[PDB]
Amino acid sequence: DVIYYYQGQITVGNVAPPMYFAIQPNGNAKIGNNSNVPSYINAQPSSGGSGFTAQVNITNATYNYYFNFMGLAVSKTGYIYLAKVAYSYTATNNPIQNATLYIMNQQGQIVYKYKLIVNGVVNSTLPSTPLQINSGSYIVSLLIVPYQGTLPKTPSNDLATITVNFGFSPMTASPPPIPLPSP
Amino acid sequence: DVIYYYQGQITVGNVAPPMYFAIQPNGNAKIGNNSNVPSYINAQPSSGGSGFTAQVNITNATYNYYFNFMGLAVSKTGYIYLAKVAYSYTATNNPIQNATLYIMNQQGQIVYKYKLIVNGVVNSTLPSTPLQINSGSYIVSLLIVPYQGTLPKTPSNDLATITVNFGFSPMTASPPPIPLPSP
Amino acid sequence: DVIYYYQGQITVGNVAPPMYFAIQPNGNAKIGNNSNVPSYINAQPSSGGSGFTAQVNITNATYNYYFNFMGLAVSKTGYIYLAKVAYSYTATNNPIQNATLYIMNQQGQIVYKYKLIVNGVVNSTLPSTPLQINSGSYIVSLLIVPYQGTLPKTPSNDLATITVNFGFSPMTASPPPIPLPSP
Amino acid sequence: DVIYYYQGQITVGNVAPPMYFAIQPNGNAKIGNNSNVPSYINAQPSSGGSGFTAQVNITNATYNYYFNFMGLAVSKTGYIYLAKVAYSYTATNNPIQNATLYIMNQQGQIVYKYKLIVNGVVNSTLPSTPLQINSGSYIVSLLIVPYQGTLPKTPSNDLATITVNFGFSPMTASPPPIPLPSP
Amino acid sequence: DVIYYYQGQITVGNVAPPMYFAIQPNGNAKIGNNSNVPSYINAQPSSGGSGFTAQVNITNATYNYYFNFMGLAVSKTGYIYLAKVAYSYTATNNPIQNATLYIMNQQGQIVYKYKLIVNGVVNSTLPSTPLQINSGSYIVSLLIVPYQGTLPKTPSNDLATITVNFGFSPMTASPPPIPLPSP
Ligand SMILES: *[C@@H]1O[C@H](CO)[C@@H](O[C@@H]2O[C@H](CO[C@H]3O[C@H](CO)[C@@H](O)[C@H](O)[C@@H]3O)[C@@H](O[C@H]3O[C@H](CO)[C@@H](O)[C@H](O)[C@@H]3O)[C@H](O[C@@H]3O[C@H](CS(=O)(=O)O)[C@@H](O[C@@H]4O[C@H](CO)[C@@H](O)[C@H](O)[C@H]4O)[C@H](O)[C@H]3O)[C@H]2NC(C)=O)[C@H](O)[C@H]1NC(C)=O
Ligand SMILES: *[C@@H]1O[C@H](CO)[C@@H](O[C@@H]2O[C@H](CO[C@H]3O[C@H](CO)[C@@H](O)[C@H](O)[C@@H]3O)[C@@H](O[C@H]3O[C@H](CO)[C@@H](O)[C@H](O)[C@@H]3O)[C@H](O[C@@H]3O[C@H](CS(=O)(=O)O)[C@@H](O[C@@H]4O[C@H](CO)[C@@H](O)[C@H](O)[C@H]4O)[C@H](O)[C@H]3O)[C@H]2NC(C)=O)[C@H](O)[C@H]1NC(C)=O
Ligand SMILES: *[C@@H]1O[C@H](CO)[C@@H](O[C@@H]2O[C@H](CO[C@H]3O[C@H](CO)[C@@H](O)[C@H](O)[C@@H]3O)[C@@H](O[C@H]3O[C@H](CO)[C@@H](O)[C@H](O)[C@@H]3O)[C@H](O[C@@H]3O[C@H](CS(=O)(=O)O)[C@@H](O[C@@H]4O[C@H](CO)[C@@H](O)[C@H](O)[C@H]4O)[C@H](O)[C@H]3O)[C@H]2NC(C)=O)[C@H](O)[C@H]1NC(C)=O
Ligand SMILES: *[C@@H]1O[C@H](CO)[C@@H](O[C@@H]2O[C@H](CO[C@H]3O[C@H](CO)[C@@H](O)[C@H](O)[C@@H]3O)[C@@H](O[C@H]3O[C@H](CO)[C@@H](O)[C@H](O)[C@@H]3O)[C@H](O[C@@H]3O[C@H](CS(=O)(=O)O)[C@@H](O[C@@H]4O[C@H](CO)[C@@H](O)[C@H](O)[C@H]4O)[C@H](O)[C@H]3O)[C@H]2NC(C)=O)[C@H](O)[C@H]1NC(C)=O
Ligand SMILES: *[C@@H]1O[C@H](CO)[C@@H](O[C@@H]2O[C@H](CO[C@H]3O[C@H](CO)[C@@H](O)[C@H](O)[C@@H]3O)[C@@H](O[C@H]3O[C@H](CO)[C@@H](O)[C@H](O)[C@@H]3O)[C@H](O[C@@H]3O[C@H](CS(=O)(=O)O)[C@@H](O[C@@H]4O[C@H](CO)[C@@H](O)[C@H](O)[C@H]4O)[C@H](O)[C@H]3O)[C@H]2NC(C)=O)[C@H](O)[C@H]1NC(C)=O
Ligand SMILES: *[C@@H]1O[C@H](CO)[C@@H](O[C@@H]2O[C@H](CO[C@H]3O[C@H](CO)[C@@H](O)[C@H](O)[C@@H]3O)[C@@H](O[C@H]3O[C@H](CO)[C@@H](O)[C@H](O)[C@@H]3O)[C@H](O[C@@H]3O[C@H](CS(=O)(=O)O)[C@@H](O[C@@H]4O[C@H](CO)[C@@H](O)[C@H](O)[C@H]4O)[C@H](O)[C@H]3O)[C@H]2NC(C)=O)[C@H](O)[C@H]1NC(C)=O
Ligand SMILES: *[C@@H]1O[C@H](CO)[C@@H](O[C@@H]2O[C@H](CO[C@H]3O[C@H](CO)[C@@H](O)[C@H](O)[C@@H]3O)[C@@H](O[C@H]3O[C@H](CO)[C@@H](O)[C@H](O)[C@@H]3O)[C@H](O[C@@H]3O[C@H](CS(=O)(=O)O)[C@@H](O[C@@H]4O[C@H](CO)[C@@H](O)[C@H](O)[C@H]4O)[C@H](O)[C@H]3O)[C@H]2NC(C)=O)[C@H](O)[C@H]1NC(C)=O
Ligand SMILES: *[C@H]1O[C@H](CO)[C@@H](O)[C@H](O)[C@@H]1O
Ligand SMILES: *[C@H]1O[C@H](CO)[C@@H](O)[C@H](O)[C@@H]1O
Ligand SMILES: *[C@H]1O[C@H](CO)[C@@H](O)[C@H](O)[C@@H]1O
Ligand SMILES: *[C@H]1O[C@H](CO)[C@@H](O)[C@H](O)[C@@H]1O
Ligand SMILES: *[C@H]1O[C@H](CO)[C@@H](O)[C@H](O)[C@@H]1O
């Protein structure tokens, strides 16, 4: 048998993140200041600012809104998009009608709106178009619209889970909407 | 292209509502007992107490008053405000001059007054200041002042519609007046 | 911050009035026929029958009586009461000792007597008890007792003003005496 | 509960009286000149000419006559009637058989005769028919016929009291005989 | 002593490569166009297309993805496999959790997935099964999943190195998975 071998050599270095999740980034007391309300939300930046984790309590309210629960810091200009969403629930009936995640200016204006879940199903059109985002820092906020009547009378900690991936690229020109592979 | 992906994970739990709309909450026969007068008003709490729906018949009377048409139960202390109002009418002429919604003590004293419509237009100053409301239960009542001469001689079911959103926050300290986003 | 939003939706329809003020209601030439005596009284039903407006000239007579100045039509049985009275005067001295407003049967019998002003002050006991009134039509008449010596020698158009609100409810069972709020 | 409120607004002005009681009206030295005879009669116009008050001493005479004790001035033509009479006495026996009040022309002719009391009782047919009276001024006179034997030997100031109400209307056409209500 | 000598004679010729690494192979502007993003990746084909060299900057992002950083051209059909992987790092803590290298169709579909590093260690099952690959050209892309918290705050050029050997055989029938010897 004849085998030809081709050698790839990859050297790995380390660079400061183009964007990261944080509480009060750069000491800005207006960005990400509602990470923790002692029976209703508990959110934290994932290790090294790599993402975020949130425990979120919905109720009977027709809109449940988690304003400024995280801060998004962007160190260098680039293009951002919603790359992937995954949704699952433990209940007999689907608990969420609509879930939307907002990136917002410090003055509370919406910069970008990301529909995660629509009429009870994940956004089907993903990955979304890469849109430019400027350097600075942004309020990030979550809105949930439950399906009324489906929420149990007895409280619970594990009604549903939403996993979301944002893709960011630090390029000068817009990339295609690249979908995130399985590792 | 280089894409960096950041993962948000949101776990959703369920909590008993800080406030809810109800008829005779906790069996209190004095709160919300006028939800239904068989040709003049028909009001109901929206599913799970998430809000309310009312069909309301105005007449030629210079003030039309719907006393105790709903009950508001508040399970834990918090801050309440008028977040958003929307108003529209099907007639050629605007039917309503003033519409005001009252939260009232069990003794019929006004706790808070919410002007929904003033001189024929929605309240422009919204969202209103968050004000503290104590735990307990409250009478809620609607006053409408028509524009006389505009109401048709023949009855109708769809003269106008008023949509109102109350924001409530279960925090110890007052929030900013956060406006409700579009989903 | 966590905000829970609760949505009220009010749909407004239109219904023929349970009672209204009119001149010669249903063409009845005996009800409300003294709305206009060309130097002494000029009364009219407010727009759509929503109430009434009267210009009323008092004189030196010890009783000044305005018989049948308005007609009250009641289309459906219900409970009526005097909800609120407001009184003010432009003169140096209080011009009115007693003012009383009567609802009367077609045969001139008194059905209900409403004391608006007593010994120069508004009725303090208001709102009055809701009393049943049958469908049909009623003479309405005003009696004023001036304070003699207080009326100026020179005539005037704006000596005093009396504002009165009647509450009517089309319910089968008597309501509490609900006071009219400020809008 | 549903309450409909109807607003009456009454604005009160002031007008020179269509008729009034006076002593020597317009300076006419023939009208009302016997208001005061120093042990037998003392009569005065009530404040602003609104009526009259008289202290009247009867004696053993079979007719007691108080000629021209008041003057009646009529500024504009209208219809006059005896609206109400009330009579009471402090004695054991009824002191008066007949009491009659006359409106008289300046020449002493009777224009109208008002029987107040007949055979010891008030006129039962009241209110009387409205009759036209012309502008000008009139003598007014009282006749009393006692029941002899009933008057005490010792004089007294409070044997009996007669209260009389005249209705006047300044209309061109005759009204019905409207009875004066209780305030 | 008796020595028997056996003569091997090897004549060496030269043949166009069955596959090679390239930027935009055959002028195809869609294959290998992300070899260079000026602070995040710098990749080049090794001399004569014999392999590739890449400098790759990871950050705090939970997935770091280097899409289309090289082009793989395959001139004749054959069988390809991952022959050998070697991994080392200069840091105190292991920087990489998972590293995966993808061969992809021009439409961005995954043809083959090569797990280089899994849970911080090199793939232990190597050499992998030879799988057929058709003639044409392929996108090649690298995904790295760091261990968060391990990456230093100060940037560096030499955090880790990954050396990878792909074996290719131009035979019609699949060979055994032959491991690459040390020279
Ligand atoms: C946590 O981070 C939050 C980020 O949202 C902060 O919320 C912001 O609070 C401001 C005032 O907060 C004070 O009062 C609250 C109680 O109400 C306390 O909880 C706080 O501790 C603090 O004491 C609020 O500002 C409003 O009030 C100001 C006076 O105090 C007044 O100057 C402002 O104009 C507001 O009325 C923020 O609200 C936003 O303010 C911006 C202007 S600025 O950024 O404040 O300068 C407004 O933008 C204007 O909007 C118009 C459009 O209508 C634009 O044309 C114009 O260009 C732009 O300036 C927003 O409309 C207004 O909503 C409020 N932030 C948001 C996004 O609502 C909170 O304070 C932080 N808490 C702590 C403890 O750090
Ligand atoms: C439905 O829910 C309604 C809630 O408003 C109830 O209305 C309340 O009705 C009370 C009596 O109702 C009875 O009579 C009506 C007919 O009139 C029937 O329809 C009912 O079925 C029932 O049979 C009424 O109380 C009044 O009457 C009482 C005697 O019966 C008397 O003790 C009260 O004082 C009242 O005069 C409610 O009216 C309010 O009462 C409170 C006191 S309390 O809450 O009743 O104890 C008053 O507050 C006082 O006010 C002063 C200020 O002036 C304060 O300083 C003082 O602290 C405070 O106590 C209110 O002024 C007075 O209006 C009446 N509720 C309201 C808000 O008006 C209705 O009953 C319910 N119907 C059914 C069938 O459940
Ligand atoms: C405007 O509306 C007014 C409403 O009050 C009308 O007033 C009513 O006028 C009747 C007659 O009017 C005629 O004469 C006047 C001049 O006097 C003109 O201005 C009118 O244009 C018209 O030409 C008057 O009726 C009286 O006269 C009748 C004969 O003409 C006689 O049959 C009546 O009995 C009266 O004497 C109204 O007076 C009331 O009448 C009722 C009976 S009914 O309703 O007329 O049938 C009486 O009720 C009786 O009373 C006893 C108690 O004592 C009860 O037991 C019994 O059950 C009941 O029948 C009233 O006592 C009596 O006062 C008079 N209405 C009132 C309330 O006084 C006016 O006509 C209208 N004008 C126009 C132009 O339309
Ligand atoms: C403010 O204005 C109110 C009306 O607008 C006045 O209310 C009236 O109160 C009368 C007694 O008021 C006294 O007592 C209260 C304490 O309760 C005090 O606050 C007052 O200062 C005052 O001292 C009340 O009258 C009742 O008692 C009378 C004996 O004194 C008696 O003659 C009456 O019959 C009553 O029982 C009034 O109650 C209603 O009266 C009407 C008739 S009318 O309006 O008075 O002419 C009745 O209607 C009758 O009902 C029967 C059936 O039962 C029918 O067949 C009939 O055809 C019909 O006439 C009601 O039944 C009766 O409830 C009351 N009036 C009203 C209309 O509510 C109040 O006093 C004023 N306040 C002040 C400070 O001046
Ligand atoms: C107070 O007001 C009283 C109103 O009645 C005045 O009474 C009227 O007094 C006249 C004369 O008074 C003089 O004399 C008395 C003593 O007797 C004094 O007290 C007075 O101060 C005063 O000095 C009196 O007139 C009579 O006398 C006249 C001559 O002095 C003579 O001209 C008259 O004709 C009388 O005889 C009034 O009597 C009435 O007079 C009218 C006419 S007029 O109005 O005087 O012009 C007569 O009417 C005529 O009658 C016929 C019918 O028979 C008709 O057809 C004809 O058209 C009509 O003219 C009356 O019949 C006659 O009674 C007398 N008034 C009355 C009503 O009797 C009194 O003077 C005043 N006092 C003061 C101080 O001011
Ligand atoms: C209560 O008091 C009332 C007056 O305050 C009395 O009314 C008067 O009734 C007289 C007749 O009464 C009899 O009939 C009724 C039934 O209808 C019964 O209830 C009574 O008990 C009694 O039996 C009436 O008189 C009329 O008839 C007379 C004949 O008997 C005749 O002489 C009169 O002329 C009348 O036709 C009264 O009617 C008015 O009278 C005045 C004059 S006066 O007041 O009587 O002196 C007339 O004025 C005249 O009018 C003309 C123009 O037409 C002028 O030119 C002239 O200058 C002027 O004098 C009226 O025209 C006439 O209508 C009547 N009086 C009044 C003032 O209304 C009642 O009887 C007393 N009730 C009791 C129980 O005692
Ligand atoms: C560098 O090389 C890259 C190789 O990946 C190129 O990426 C490809 O870009 C296409 C469009 O690029 C244009 O827009 C971007 C900004 O977004 C600029 O950077 C570029 O310069 C350029 O201007 C992109 O195509 C998409 O957009 C097209 C419209 O412009 C549209 O026709 C396509 O359908 C895409 O939506 C490529 O994305 C892939 O396209 C293929 C089809 S095709 O190969 O384009 O014809 C899709 O395959 C389809 O997928 C379904 C499964 O869902 C299959 O059933 C079906 O058979 C198949 O056709 C892919 O799903 C879609 O992702 C994009 N390539 C990839 C792999 O994503 C880049 O352009 C090159 N840049 C330069 C400057 O040369
Ligand atoms: C940003 O600049 C890069 C070069 O670094 C280009 O590749 C891109 O097209 C954009 O101009
Ligand atoms: C209520 O308490 C919370 C902590 O749960 C504070 O954030 C707030 O300022 C108020 O004191
Ligand atoms: C009239 O009827 C209504 C029902 O429409 C009841 O609520 C009331 O008690 C009265 O009987
Ligand atoms: C007097 O005139 C009035 C109009 O002012 C009429 O109502 C009445 O009938 C009489 O003719
Ligand atoms: C491809 O063809 C070769 C001959 O060149 C065989 O050895 C092999 O088995 C496959 O058929």
Author numbering:
A (entry chain B), B (entry chain C), C (entry chain D), D (entry chain E), E (entry chain A): 24 to 206
Relevant lines from the article:
While some archaea produce only one type of filament, the archaeal model species Sulfolobus acidocaldarius generates four.
Through cryoEM and visual proteomics, we previously determined that the thread consists of multiple copies of the subunit Saci_0406, and resembles, but is not homologous to, bacterial Type-I (chaperone-usher; CU) pili. Saci_0406 consists of a β-strand rich globular c-terminus and an extended N-terminal β-strand. Like in CU pili, the N-terminal strand inserts into a downstream subunit, thereby completing a β-sheet via donor strand complementation (DSC). The subunits additionally form intermolecular isopeptide bonds, thus covalently interlinking the thread into a strong, chain-like fibre. Owing to its distinct architecture, the thread is considerably thinner (40 Å) than archaella (110 Å) and Aap (80 Å). We were able to model a mannose molecule into the density, with α-mannose resulting in a better fit than β-mannose.
